[PDB]
Amino acid sequence: SSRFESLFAG
Amino acid sequence: CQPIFLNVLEAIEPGVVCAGHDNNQPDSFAALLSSLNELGERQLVHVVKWAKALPGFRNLHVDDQMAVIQYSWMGLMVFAMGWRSFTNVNSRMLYFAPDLVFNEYRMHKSRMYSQCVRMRHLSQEFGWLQITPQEFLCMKALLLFSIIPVDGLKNQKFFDELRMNYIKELDRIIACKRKNPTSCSRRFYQLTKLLDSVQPIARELHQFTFDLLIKSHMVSVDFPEMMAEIISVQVPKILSGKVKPIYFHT
Ligand SMILES: C[C@]12CCC(=O)C[C@@H]1CC[C@@H]1[C@@H]2CC[C@]2(C)[C@@H](O)CC[C@@H]12
To answer: Domains of chain B (ranges plus CATH)?
Structure first.
């Protein structure tokens, strides 16, 4: 999701 | 010949992660679980960096890259913790982090004693089965590709191909010093049984953390925003049967 996606994106 | 695959797995293996727990305070349910949650978030950062560096991981559609991590982090982290417990304290305690080690008293105080004892048993099996560091690395990587949605991934074919390749690598590691096919078969049976055993534990923890998040404000347990997101958006997909583990045995 948003928070995880941001982490994943760097 | 160079063990390219294993060279990579050893090279990308995350280092030590601390929980930030205050061991000077008397143990309490709220503090122990809040620290486990913080540790979960800290380890997730490393799991993401680790996963993205795995051989062939980029072959997967990006949406699937994110999905497999969000579904398998519990199993991955429990497996790694069991290995740490075995190597650092011979399974005498659960070595979540250098600053968060659980003796039986803490297992009880955490209110998930049954799950903790099952994790301690998992840790003991690393010793009973004489799991090598190389088998551990390959098995842990395989755990990232052991849980998928019933409705299918964006590109299920690429995922199936990658999982197959990791199983092939596990076969190669088993055959290294084994010339007899029967010896390899026996080892594969043992390792797949161990891998399967991680799933029921992960599900119990998924259920426990889900219930804890729902009543977190009532028990003073803090959940980092990202963990709250994953546990409320992804974990329920697993608990409701929409996402399921891939078992080797029935
Ligand atoms: C994955 C972690 C944290 C990382 C680890 O070493 C394994 C351990 C297993 C129990 C989890 C914990 C993270 C926080 C959870 C999910 C708590 O909310 C309840 C169960 C805990």
So the answer is: 1-250 (1.10.565.10)
